[PDB]
Symmetry: C3
Subunit: 275 residues, 3 copies
Amino acid sequence: PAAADKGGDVRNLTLYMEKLPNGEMGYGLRPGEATIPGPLIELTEGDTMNIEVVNNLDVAASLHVHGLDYDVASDGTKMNDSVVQPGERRTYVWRTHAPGKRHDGTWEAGSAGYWHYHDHNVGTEHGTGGIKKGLYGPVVVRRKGDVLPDKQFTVVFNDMTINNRTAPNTPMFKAVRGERVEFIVITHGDFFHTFHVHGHRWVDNRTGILEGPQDVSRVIDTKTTGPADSFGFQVIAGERVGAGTWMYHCHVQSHSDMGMSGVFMVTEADGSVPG
Amino acid sequence: PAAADKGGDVRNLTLYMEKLPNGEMGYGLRPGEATIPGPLIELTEGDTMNIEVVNNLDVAASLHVHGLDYDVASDGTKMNDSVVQPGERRTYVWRTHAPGKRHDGTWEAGSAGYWHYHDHNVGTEHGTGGIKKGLYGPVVVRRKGDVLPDKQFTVVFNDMTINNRTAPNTPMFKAVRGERVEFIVITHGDFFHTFHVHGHRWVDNRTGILEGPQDVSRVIDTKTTGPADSFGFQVIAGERVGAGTWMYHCHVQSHSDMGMSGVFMVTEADGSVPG
Amino acid sequence: PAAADKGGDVRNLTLYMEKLPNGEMGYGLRPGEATIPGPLIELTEGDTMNIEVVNNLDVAASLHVHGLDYDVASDGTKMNDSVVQPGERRTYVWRTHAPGKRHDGTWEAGSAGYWHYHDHNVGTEHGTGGIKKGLYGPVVVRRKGDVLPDKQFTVVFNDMTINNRTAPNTPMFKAVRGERVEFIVITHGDFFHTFHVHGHRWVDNRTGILEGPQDVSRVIDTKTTGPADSFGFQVIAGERVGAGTWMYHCHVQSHSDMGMSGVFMVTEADGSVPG
Ligand SMILES: [Cu+2]
Ligand SMILES: [Cu+2]
Ligand SMILES: [Cu+2]
Ligand SMILES: [Cu+2]
Ligand SMILES: [Cu+2]
Ligand SMILES: [Cu+2]
Ligand SMILES: [Cu+2]
Ligand SMILES: [Cu+2]
Ligand SMILES: [Cu+2]
């Protein structure tokens, strides 16, 4: 299995905050290529990201990240003077660290995990407006040695939507049976959800993956998730269960009845799927 | 104490889906013996369950399970043609597995845990009407060597009820001080709850029991649980606290004031209780 | 840093239940010195607390505790005849224990953790009115050898407030960069929240501190919390991120927009802060 090498690179990135059709807003890697969710930023403990943010919106907006090391200047809040005016640009710096023992003999936990970034200034000083309209994206921080996936899918429960869509227009994630698949699950907005995926399960720990025989973590297939929670996991697609149309949905009954569901399509190597 | 043996047996079961008084629906081991919750199904990692489901309801209904290994033909969904017409029957198959190393050296987590089954077709294609009316039940999968209880009690928070009842008609669970009692807690429907039991506590891990001196798990007596969450634990009834009428309830205040509570009655050997 | 000694001491405390301005109620260490939250109670596994409760309210009221060992006489409920009439007093006893093996070879988990106490009789038999008006407070139980903090901050999400207040009147917690600070987070009432603090993160286990290399727990900066949930953690203030005005808030967007936020102000040694 492919595994993450040691971290420690300084990386540069540019994000464009752009208007999208029908009043939505998105981050993109190039102008006119903004998506909801925004691009996935992946790094390894020790890496630094210098992210230039270009605001092509009509109102001041920002970039706030969960979990990583940043100083108040990269807070993403008006309060700490960390927002971007229309037509301007600003650099936000994200640092990360490996686990280590402090001089006092206590353990500092590393940066690795499933995280996210989003706007903190549109609509309100908590970014309620920007989050609603699509300004959110995933961040994966690896630890050295972490197993890497073949595919990555991001599910954002944004109020009563999946990635701002409802069924049947929610994303379908396709993989081949046996592929290692990574899910990143983020919740935003005003409501609490339960993420459930048919035919698959994962370990309720940092990686979603059993670490070894002394791992006492619950194995689950449903997880409560509320605004700005983030978690992730990896499955072998179709393991023990075969190819097929596997629903992923919020299991709150009114929510799934109102369209908070989508398809995880696990196919055979030739692309066929039962049904 | 009694501990679960090595699994790997093929077991057969028949469930009947039956109308109950006042528009309710339950699963039963025999016609006319349907209960809410349905019968507890217990197996050990490696065991296979072949479950014949007889539908004596007036609408098509199904059986969907969390956590266990099943193919799309036992998905319990109309989408994968996995439902039972009124007056017909259909066999669903649940497989389970123990933990193990894959070829690529990674670890597959075992099936063991606190799980559940429910309808996925009555009312809506997510089972909203069937779940509402009582079509749900607990599943327990053991790992070999897991400690076994003397009693098992199932608590389902279904919307604003416990097992479709409200106080004072919610179930009283009875045990003698010192007995090993196992609780299985499932939530269904539209709302989020906090399960709490007076005078007792457990470990927030797979078994609810401390695995050993290495186990870093939180020790809790309250837990958030949302639609289709399932967990469970064992306590020694009355340990360190004595016999008594020990409340269990949802700790959301409006919910407890509206009848979401019941009694865990821990008696002396002679059946007496303080008060 | 400082580490907790072994427990096994018997401690005595008096709490006064007192009317507060504008219809609020609080627990206090002296008459006229009640606070919301009530005073923090800290002990070590094996310690016993004898708490004399003086009810100076106009209605019968009580003391109910999570997590610790108590018999039904200290249950705090009317049903177990465990309340205090106006103008009277009553002693509640809390015991605790260390982990250990029972005779049957199973592990009994210890009492250590982040816990809380509240009224269980004012307004309703579940203390709904007493909890609403301010009758709650934190409890910290240590394990022998636990790292001890320099400061303790208690955040109680009580319905749509923090310690019964909204911004700008929510508590400001101050510490110097490098100081070891402890947060205790408790939710009460009718709603679910997600606690988030900018610039800081912790380990989702008993202590909030990484135990060592084998600790598989999710490292997080956001956590769902519902009524009577309690957790806690320690951080090194400003670690990797510097001094600053670091927001803590519920991340439910309407809740934060409606005042569920406050300031964690990390200063330099001389009291200065950026901004
Ligand atoms: Cu914020
Ligand atoms: Cu939902
Ligand atoms: Cu955020
Ligand atoms: Cu489903
Ligand atoms: Cu509830
Ligand atoms: Cu389900
Ligand atoms: Cu209670
Ligand atoms: Cu909130
Ligand atoms: Cu309580």
